[PDB]
């Protein structure tokens, strides 16, 4: 299933070089992971911890932080930012 | 098209958490990029430069270094490490 990011999420994907306006969910996740690593928003020590306050990513989530283990939260963020 | 990594390339994909023995080429590329970032094998200053000597990745390539701009070289490395 192709999904269609809303504009802010699209800006995030473009910032790591994604070149399309539709992607699979797997691809959206891949690009989001590239973005988090690029911006080093994860804790070097315990690398599931992400701090995203005042980042574009924090605006998408509406939260200052999350753990990568919070799969419901992450999937829900993504869906809130898709044109379904 | 699904591709089937040979053992050393499979070890590299497993090291970032890939959980399958077949993937698309796009997926192989995604995981390889995750590996390079994780191991910080790219130059912080000019981020297309990768130094991989004495790393698992250098053994796959058979070279100590490459630029990400060398697309023929990178694709050829991958194919040399697939069960076709």
């Amino acid at each position: 299933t192709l999904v269609r990011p809303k504009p802010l999420l699209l800006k995030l994907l473009k910032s790591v070089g994604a070149q399309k306006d539709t992607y699979t969910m797997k691809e959206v996740l891949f690009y989001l992971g590239q973005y988090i690593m690029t911006k080093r928003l994860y804790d070097e020590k315990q690398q599931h911890i992400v701090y995203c306050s005042n980042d574009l990513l924090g605006d998408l989530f509406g939260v200052p932080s999350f753990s990568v283990k919070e799969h419901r939260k992450i999937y829900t963020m993504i869906y809130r930012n898709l044109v379904v | 098209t699904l591709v089937r990594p040979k053992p050393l390339l499979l070890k590299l994909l497993k090291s970032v958490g890939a959980q399958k023995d077949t993937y698309t080429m796009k997926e192989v590329l995604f995981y390889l990029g995750q590996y390079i970032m994780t191991k910080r094998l790219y130059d912080e200053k000019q981020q297309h430069i990768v130094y991989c000597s004495n790393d698992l990745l250098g053994d796959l390539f058979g070279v100590p270094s490459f630029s990400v701009k060398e697309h023929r070289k990178i694709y050829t490395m991958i194919y040399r490490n697939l069960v076709v």
Partner: peptide, 11 residues
């Protein structure tokens, strides 16, 4: 466990 390892569990 690296970030990528945790992140890949999402898919």
């Amino acid at each position: 466990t690296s970030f990528a390892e945790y992140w890949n569990l999402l898919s």
